[PDB]
Amino acid sequence: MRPEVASTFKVLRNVTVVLWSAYPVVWLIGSEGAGIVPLNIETLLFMVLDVSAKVGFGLILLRSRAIFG
Structure with a gap:
């Protein structure tokens, strides 16, 4: 692996986008x-x-x- 500047930047974007899409899903579960x-x-x-x-x-x-x- 490589903890590059590019690497960490892309990882950040991945995590944030995933969390965002998951947010309404998790809500719906906790508000059936x-x-x-x-x-x-x-x-x-x-x-x-x-x-x-x-x-x-x-x-x-x-x-x-x-x-x-």
Whole structure:
């Protein structure tokens, strides 16, 4: 190995970036029920989108088969 100036600089950046990305992950673990509120909001929004898309797809399919026959 070599404890170079370049070496130590790059090591510092690596550690800091890793810690940063890990920070929200660790939080979520230590706030499963606590910070559930925002999680619920997002899940609801996503589900609504899913439903509307599914309905649209159904309508398209009906139209297509009618035109074909």
